[PDB]
Design a protein around this ligand. Structure first.
Ligand code: NI
Length: 341
């Protein structure tokens, strides 16, 4: 049945709740972003109002064929009225089109739902600064102190420098980058830009990217793999067997592959700095796991919450085990005692 942490009290609303059939009492279904664990359930046969960003609405129409009459895109940073309730969509610093949602309940309670987010100090200057938030529905994906990672900027500097050095030493090397969803576009686009190439990809992935309102995108991507020396493949193909096979397909144009897997966290982070990352190599194939995250680190999450000072926190991730739930609740209490709220 629909879990309580997907329902907004005092409303008829749900968030990211498309796989439970008709949720009893739901008058508007919000969708924070286009990732499959959140949209699971949607299709051309859905006939209730879906509220989302413009970008998410482009993906719903083009990729899932949801009918236009049921898609209600809202502008960001703008007070809107939905079924009699004031709402605002904020940038979540997650994947393209991802939002946080502020609900202003008729009784005066204010609720923020983060969806999936990567907390940032820039959020401390949005419309969130303007009033008190009472209840926080929090993306707790990496809510434990072991989870550190570098800035996105540090990670892209590493990737760009590695790629440029490799291809300048060997102009016959091919760069491959893995993907299995939207998000992390900066990895492949920044590498193609330093090399003077477009990124080559499947027709399906090209279609997906053309829904994202990225500026000048026609100049950066292509379905012509032969004209490109940065290729995008499914994340499942980023292994030695899959890469050897791909190299065969390129007909002796290339003699070396340098591949990137943008993981979330991996326990090489507890020890290793970004400067010290090394690849796995077999023959003329090397594979780099880089820690490019679109979720908050522990410290980023903690700073956001201690700034916001909510009265009640409802986790939305890692809620399936009692040990995880109890650990998170202990951190929330530490944060509150340290900060004084
Ligand atoms: Ni997500």
């Amino acid at each position: 049945t629909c879990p309580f942490y997907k329902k907004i009290p005092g409303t008829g609303f749900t968030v990211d709740a498309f796989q439970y059939g008709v949720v009893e009492g739901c008058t508007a279904y919000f969708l924070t972003h286009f990732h499959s664990d959140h949209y699971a359930g949607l299709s051309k046969h859905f006939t209730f109002p879906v509220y989302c960003s413009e970008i998410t609405g482009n993906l719903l129409k083009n990729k899932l064929h949801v009918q236009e009459q049921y898609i209600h895109p809202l502008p960001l940073d703008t007070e809107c009225i939905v079924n009699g309730v004031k709402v605002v969509l904020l940038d979540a610093n997650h994947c393209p089109g991802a939002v946080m949602i502020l609900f202003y309940l008729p009784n005066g309670t204010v609720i923020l739902h983060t969806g999936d987010f990567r907390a940032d100090p820039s959020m401390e200057r949005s419309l969130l600064a303007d009033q008190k938030v009472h209840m926080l529905y929090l993306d707790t994906t990496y809510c434990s102190p072991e989870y550190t990672f570098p800035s996105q900027q540090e990670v892209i500097r590493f990737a760009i420098n590695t790629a440029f050095e490799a291809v300048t030493l060997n102009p016959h090397a091919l760069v491959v980058c893995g993907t299995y969803s939207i998000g992390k576009e900066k990895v492949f686009l920044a590498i193609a830009d330093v090399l003077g190439s477009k990124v080559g990809m499947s027709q399906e992935k090209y279609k997906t990217l053309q829904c994202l309102n990225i500026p000048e995108i026609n100049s950066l991507i292509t379905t012509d793999m032969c004209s490109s020396l940065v290729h995008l493949l499914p994340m499942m193909q980023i292994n030695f067997k899959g890469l050897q096979s791909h190299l065969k397909k390129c007909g002796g144009k290339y003699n070396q592959i340098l591949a990137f897997r943008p993981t979330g966290w991996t326990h090489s982070n507890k020890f290793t700095r970004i400067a010290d990352v090394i690849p796995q190599t077999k023959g003329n194939i090397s594979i780099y796991g880089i820690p490019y995250s679109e979720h908050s680190s522990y410290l980023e999450m903690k700073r956001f919450v201690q700034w916001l000072k909510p009265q009640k926190i409802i986790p939305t991730v890692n809620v399936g085990t009692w040990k995880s739930r109890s650990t998170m609740e202990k951190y929330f209490r530490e944060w509150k005692l340290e900060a004084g709220y």
